[PDB]
């Protein structure tokens, strides 16, 4: 049930007029499409075919870890999770509060634009707080903006400084580009909607 249902409440009836309402969510889908291709495909090799030229037992495991703490496809994953949360927390805040107020005062809209158009504004703030919280780590945590073919790993139980090699560090980067590019694009659309709610207050 991954993707189709998040839109049943995420693609709500009639919220705003900016042409960036759907655009942002079409990417949200696109961006989980590109990741549901990367993950199962290019990262399985991450640990397997990660070769350290040393016979020294501890080394290779320690050399992956010291170098790949939260692997990229689990970061990319967490991104799509956190930045998914505001989207579905709001849609949840709506289908609840709207269903509630309605069926309670029917037997016995200033608060529909009040309560909900307000949490949605702070959501949009949350979206770009997350989309940028990770975009940050993904750039600070991981030794520049990509990954090298080999790394020189000083992991504890290696003898002195040893070599190791990653698997397809280009295909791995390629997908770090797209996912980082679309991570920026999806930042601007998010900030444009936080901008439009700062223009008319």
- Interface with a copy of itself (CB under 8 A), residue total 70
| Of 80-88, 131-139, 181-189, 193-201: span binding a copy of itself (CB under 8 A) | 80-88
Q: Is 141 in the site for a copy of itself (CB under 8 A)?
A: no
- Contact between 173 and 146 under an 8 Å Cβ cutoff? The reply is yes
Q: What Rg do the C-alpha atoms of the chain give, in angstroms?
A: 22
| Of 105-113, 126-134, 155-163, 187-195: span binding a copy of itself (CB under 8 A) | 155-163
- Exposed / middle / buried, residue 158 (Cβ in 10 Å: 0-12, 13-18, 19+): buried
- Contact between 125 and 198 under an 8 Å Cβ cutoff? The reply is no
Distances (CA, A) of 107 to 30, 100, 141: 44, 12, 56
d(CA 194, CA 42): 35
- Contact between 164 and 63 under an 8 Å Cβ cutoff? The reply is yes
Q: Is 113 in the site for a copy of itself (CB under 8 A)?
A: no
| Of 62-70, 105-113, 125-133, 185-193: span binding a copy of itself (CB under 8 A) | 62-70
Q: Is 107 in the site for a copy of itself (CB under 8 A)?
A: no
Q: Is 160 in the site for a copy of itself (CB under 8 A)?
A: no
CB of 77: closest distance to a copy of itself in angstroms?
5
CB of 150: closest distance to a copy of itself in angstroms?
6
Distances (CA, A) of 30 to 35, 101, 118, 146: 9, 35, 28, 22
Whether 131 has a binding-site annotation, put simply, is: no
Identity of the residue, 6 or 190, whose beta carbon is nearer to a copy of itself in the bound complex:
6
Among 37, 112, 195, 198, binds a copy of itself (CB under 8 A): 37
Annotated binding residues for Ca(2+), as ranges? 41, 44, 46
């Amino acid at each position: 049930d991954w993707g189709t249902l998040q839109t049943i409440l995420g693609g709500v009836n009639k919220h705003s007029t900016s042409i960036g309402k759907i655009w942002l969510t079409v990417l949200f889908i696109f961006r989980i499409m590109i990741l549901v291709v990367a993950a199962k495909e290019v990262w399985g090799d991450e640990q397997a075919d990660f070769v350290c030229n040393t016979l020294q037992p501890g080394c290779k495991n320690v050399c992956y870890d010291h170098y790949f703490p939260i692997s990229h496809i689990r970061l990319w994953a967490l991104q799509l999770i956190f930045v998914s949360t505001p989207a579905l927390l709001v849609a949840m805040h709506v289908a609840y509060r709207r269903h509630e107020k309605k069926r309670k005062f029917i037997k016995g809209k200033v608060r529909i634009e009040g309560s909900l158009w307000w949490t949605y504004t702070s959501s949009i703030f949350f979206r770009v707080i997350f989309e940028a919280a990770f975009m940050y780590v993904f750039y600070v945590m991981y030794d520049g903006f990509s990954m090298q073919r080999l790394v020189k790993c000083n992991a504890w139980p290696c003898p002195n400084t040893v070599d190791c090699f990653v698997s397809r560090p280009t295909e791995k980067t390629v997908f770090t580009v797209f996912m980082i590019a679309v991570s920026g694009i999806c930042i601007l659309l998010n900030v444009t909607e936080l901008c439009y709610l700062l223009i008319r207050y």
